[PDB]
Design a protein around this ligand. Sequence first.
Ligand SMILES: O=C(O)[C@H](O)[C@@H](O)[C@H](O)[C@H](O)COP(=O)(O)O
Ligand SMILES: O=C(O)[C@H](O)[C@@H](O)[C@H](O)[C@H](O)COP(=O)(O)O
Ligand SMILES: O=C(O)[C@H](O)[C@@H](O)[C@H](O)[C@H](O)COP(=O)(O)O
Ligand SMILES: [Mg+2]
Ligand SMILES: [Mg+2]
Ligand SMILES: [Mg+2]
Ligand SMILES: [Mg+2]
Lengths: 122, 122, 444, 443, 225, 119, 105
Amino acid sequence: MQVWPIEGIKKFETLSYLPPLTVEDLLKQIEYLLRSKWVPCLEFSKVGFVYRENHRSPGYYDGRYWTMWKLPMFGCTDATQVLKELEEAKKAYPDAFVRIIGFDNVRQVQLISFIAYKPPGC
Amino acid sequence: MQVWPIEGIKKFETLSYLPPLTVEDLLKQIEYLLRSKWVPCLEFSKVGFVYRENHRSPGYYDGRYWTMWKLPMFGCTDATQVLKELEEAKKAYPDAFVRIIGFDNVRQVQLISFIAYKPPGC
Amino acid sequence: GFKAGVTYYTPEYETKDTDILAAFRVTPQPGVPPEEAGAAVAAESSTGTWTTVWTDGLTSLDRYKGRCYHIEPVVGEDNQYIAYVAYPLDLFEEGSVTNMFTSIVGNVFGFKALRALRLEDLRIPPTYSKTFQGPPHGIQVERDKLNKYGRPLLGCTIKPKLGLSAKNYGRACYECLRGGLDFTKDDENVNSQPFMRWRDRFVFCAEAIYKSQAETGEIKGHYLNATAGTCEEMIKRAVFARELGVPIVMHDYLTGGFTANTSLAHYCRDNGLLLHIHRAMHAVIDRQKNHGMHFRVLAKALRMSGGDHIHAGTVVGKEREMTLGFVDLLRDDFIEKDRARGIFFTQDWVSMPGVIPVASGGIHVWHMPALTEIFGDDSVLQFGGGTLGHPWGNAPGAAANRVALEACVQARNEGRDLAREGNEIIRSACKWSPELAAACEIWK
Amino acid sequence: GFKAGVKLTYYTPEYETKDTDILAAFRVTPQPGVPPEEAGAAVAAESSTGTWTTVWTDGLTSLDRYKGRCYHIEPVVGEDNQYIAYVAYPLDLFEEGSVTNMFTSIVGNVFGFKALRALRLEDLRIPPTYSKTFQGPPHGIQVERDKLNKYGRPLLGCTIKPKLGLSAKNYGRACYECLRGGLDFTKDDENVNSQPFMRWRDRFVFCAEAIYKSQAETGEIKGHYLNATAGTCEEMIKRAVFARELGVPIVMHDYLTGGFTANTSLAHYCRDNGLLLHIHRAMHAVIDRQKNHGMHFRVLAKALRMSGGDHIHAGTVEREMTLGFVDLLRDDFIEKDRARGIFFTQDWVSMPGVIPVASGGIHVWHMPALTEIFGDDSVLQFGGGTLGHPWGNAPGAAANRVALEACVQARNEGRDLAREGNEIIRSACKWSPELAAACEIWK
Amino acid sequence: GFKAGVKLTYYTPEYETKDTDILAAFRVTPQPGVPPEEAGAAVAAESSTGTWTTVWTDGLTSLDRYKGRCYHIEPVVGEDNQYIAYVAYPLDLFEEGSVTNMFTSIVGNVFGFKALRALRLEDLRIPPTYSKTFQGPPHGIQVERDKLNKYGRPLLGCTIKPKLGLSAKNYGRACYECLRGGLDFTKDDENVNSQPFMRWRDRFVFCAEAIYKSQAETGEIKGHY
Amino acid sequence: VGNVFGFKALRALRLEDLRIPPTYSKTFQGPPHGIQVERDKLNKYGRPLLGCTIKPKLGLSAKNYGRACYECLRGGLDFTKDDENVNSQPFMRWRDRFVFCAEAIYKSQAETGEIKGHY
Amino acid sequence: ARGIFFTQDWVSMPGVIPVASGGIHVWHMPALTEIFGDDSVLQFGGGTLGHPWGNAPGAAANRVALEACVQARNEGRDLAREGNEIIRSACKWSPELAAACEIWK
Ligand SMILES: O=C(O)[C@H](O)[C@@H](O)[C@H](O)[C@H](O)COP(=O)(O)O
Ligand SMILES: O=C(O)[C@H](O)[C@@H](O)[C@H](O)[C@H](O)COP(=O)(O)O
Ligand SMILES: O=C(O)[C@H](O)[C@@H](O)[C@H](O)[C@H](O)COP(=O)(O)O
Ligand SMILES: [Mg+2]
Ligand SMILES: [Mg+2]
Ligand SMILES: [Mg+2]
Ligand SMILES: [Mg+2]
């Protein structure tokens, strides 16, 4: 019988329970986005999880929004371009978590979000 | 006249005002659980006391629940087996508090809880 | 056929599972046979009338009459008998202890043919008890809420009851709680008075509760007395306790009354507050063996009206059997008839939660073994002078009691006989606990 | 210094009571081997600041200002072990306006002290300084007479029977017939609250129709004591509220079984809404029957006057003792009188009085005696005495009303009701067929 | 000991019903090949504590205290595949005063079980210990007769038609004429709540005028549902 | 469906579908939030949500019930759930269950960093 | 053919998330994911509380199985045909899932 860890295993929703995603793994997830005609975008934060500082009413949480890295990559047709931006973000903010999200103009909502980089020690 | 300490003496309910329990002392308390036909279970936490972060309404407290070490030892008839698990917990989590709890399926409630291990600075 | 002019003793009657049964200790007046005494008890506590009334012809009386179905001599007494009476379920208002008491003991005790009368027990049928909320929480829920298991709970009753400022009162509370006690308590007389108004007491006691809780890491509480002159005031006090987020409030159920107590019990259920019940004034009613109401009846009534804790005496010494009897009636789900313990009827509570019995009085550390053995873990032991009287103060006094208790618990769990090794268990604990050693020297 | 653990302080024979002290007279029966001074002394300590071991917190205040004091002890003529211990309690011990606290403070603990074999609270001296913190009766004797426009005679009522078993409508029918015959009120039994087959709201509706039908027929104001006694305060008030909506004049409460906290709340509601409040003393005998232990009814009576009530049951016809507490219930100033069980001079400083109510197995032949004993300021309840008349409720009510007025007329003329009672009733029988019929059945 | 998981705990023909149990009579039609005993067990299991895989949390309490149990199965005369399965449910499973919970607890899940081709709840034995937690009728037969002062005959009413299409006033007119002729009540169709052309408050106003006009005319108490 | 299913001329009747016109549906609030709003509120995207229905449905104390919830949530499930039969009953009254389940929700949420809930 | 007898227009009224429940476990994850897609809730009662290592490991097993299915689907794999392989492959790096798969195969 094995005990599930209580620390060092904090999560970032979808795909964060799989082993660390390799560059190839990430590329395929990004390609899924482009194939589905969704717009990829990078987001980063030095705080990786939700909290409740300003209110505790139903549905209210702080820390859901992170910061946008530049703008959504509209018209992107090369998944490699997204990786390029991820590398730039990591270079500028090596101490920040970076996730890849996706927007769909047809459904008119954000509909994808997965962690792509975690700072050393996080 | 002697003054009761204000620090370094935080408690863990039943039996925590007694001197540190020896291995022999611990086995006797476990056997009591077994003779009483109750099910022993280990619980651990890196936070040893109660607090009120999410609410302050009557009867609500955070920190009452700790994390379960594996599962309740149903059918256990050897107090030594409980000791074995306590040692594994201490080895896996030397910086966490570990307590032994008990459940009774007749009264249908948890009915035992005493500290069994405190780190090297608590 | 009317007939103006000037039916209750039925030994052939078979009780219904919906009947409320009563066991009355009756002392007939001279020249009054016990059979006549029994009928009077039943008639005067139900449909009996001195003269014939034509309105009886508009309904079916044998459907609403109380019936004395059995009478037996009292062991030892020469003119005392136990008369058993059955009352139809339809006579009682659902969820009202006030009506149950009014219906059964509201009139019969003043009947001329009865020199003396005492209600010993009541068989509350499930069909009637299910119409009551009962304890706001009950034994098991309380232990889970406070995260306390495997030992009696400990509390200190603050003294002097009257005379301290709200702040000095709260200071005493903090010191008691930080030393190891689970609760501190307001005296039954402490409501709101000149020099110590209730809201000020609530504020300082709340500060004390939280200061001690933060220091020790264990959940603490103070029985904040909400007993008041009016229901509006009583609720007002419970409301502020709720705002403060404290775990428990208190009520003197007999002096405040059942209508008010039930209202308070409902409020506590709706707001997650534990309810400590003090039995002030009970001895005015339950002390004499020949007249009144035995405490076990008042205890069942409280469980039905609502309370999480209830004082059960001191039972201290080495009455024991009678106390264990009503303690079971208060805590257990099913209690079999046991005359040796004052249990006249088998009582089935059909899952209504139990109430934690509270032991109090002039008890101290040397009584810990006996108290633990008598009550077991599901009890609250209150030490007033036994804490505030410690030579080193409240915190050390609390520690002495907590240590003495855990020593007894440890010994009992290991299989030792508290009823025989009690003193030795305490003496052994004195070896490593200076606080306990100091307490034992003063009260031995 | 605070040193230690485990009649020298609580027995003060020359203490002079203060006008603000609450005084108590306890009938004490000491255990064998216990001096009466220690007995009376323990009564004081155990009903105040007693403590088995010394506590340092006592040094943070002045306990002598909070202790009860036994200032006098005397034997009860005829007992080798029964005495009356007088105790004085400081005003500061009591919460203003709370009978609940007064009872808790004085009788909440002492009765179980084992050095005492038996204890009975006989009387309490309620100081004006404390009674002025209580509303008292919602209306009181004088206001009630003015509201109902009834003067010069005891009021009359009928307690409906059978208490349980009748439908709300049949119940109301019985009420109408009683009221139309001459009775001022009809009444719910103490046990009648809300039950299967007769729920309270239905009873209130039909009784209201009965009240108004009989009032319109006779031209005299009528009422029915609608019992608001309930399991919770919310329910109790809910019932008083509907009575208010119906516009009826009076409601009822079983003060001891419902409790003082609830009773005080109801008395307040009645004052705020112009409702008279009839108080039934159900369960009092559990406490006040035995001379050796408990609380005498006069204490429970004073407590009710304080908590609030316009009527209060007082018996059925001991004599001297009854006249004593009746005065305590009705008058403004009552001088001490041991012959009538009045242990303390009682000054009510204008708090209204309560109308005493007589009930039980009484009938027309008891009318002269009842009128003589209680006087005009009382209510006489005839349950079987009305519903048991051979001609029905209306004639039964008429018989009682006639018998009463015959007694009142005679008394007013100067006749001795105590000696000419039977002759007064026999004479009335000669012109009242209704009374004659009743007199032949209950002679 | 707790292990993996996977009628063995629900068909108890020896079980003696308790006076506090809620009893149910289910007309069950088993799927082909399903033994009558297995179907009855399934009815009890799937309407109570039956779980597909063993869960260790069951070890924290006493199951036999919360399981519904099929205590009797009777074949239905004339059917080669129909039986009445009787199930007893402990009192503690039900929330006091809640018909919603009683239905949820008994018929909330079992009717969809694949092993049962068809299932029909025929009756329920409501124990006094449970029914006493319910208010029941606001008034009931006897109180109603006393309130309306009507005795010795069935009451009479007319259900207004057309249910929809009349103005509130024309509707009330129809009511008045019915009541004045000798009927005790007039009635709103089950479909008549509040709709375009006849809003509820307007209907209540005109029906009230009709109730009182007819009552004053006849001298008998009138009403409109 | 209020009256027709009982007509004797029909041996059996089943309503299969209803065409709700926009003119009628627009008079209803509809879902308090709906699929998209829920995903945004919980900050969960790209996968089905996961939950565990607590068992045994009846028999556990409110606290033991809550303990089971905490352990389920901390392992990766988004929600834990009350059985349809679990409302308020002897041994597990609703307010006690709410208190303990709330402690479980917040303990697991703080531990994992993901938003948690209990039906 | 799918029981839709009328064209239904909801004119922007929000949708409701469908919930799958019953005797389902890790091996059903691929099928469940393919049938309902992302906008659904999958309830695992016995499928969690029945895991040999307890609730936390049970939850982890279900969360891992689901994300493995989601990942594979996103890459373009056929869940209806490669389901078992997707789960078996995930068992290699997830002891929790491996334990679950051994119990309910
Ligand atoms: O303040 C206190 O210390 C208690 O209230 C005390 O005065 C009381 O005497 C005991 O609790 C026993 O009383 P009972 O046996 O009457 O409960
Ligand atoms: O219902 C009634 O007819 C009365 O309630 C009656 O039962 C009662 O016996 C008398 O009122 C005297 O009672 P007390 O003297 O005890 O008040
Ligand atoms: O407690 C549970 O585990 C569920 O509530 C379960 O008992 C129910 O059978 C499924 O939810 C499917 O039922 P339906 O398909 O009928 O919804
Ligand atoms: Mg006290
Ligand atoms: Mg009466
Ligand atoms: Mg219709
Ligand atoms: Mg379910």
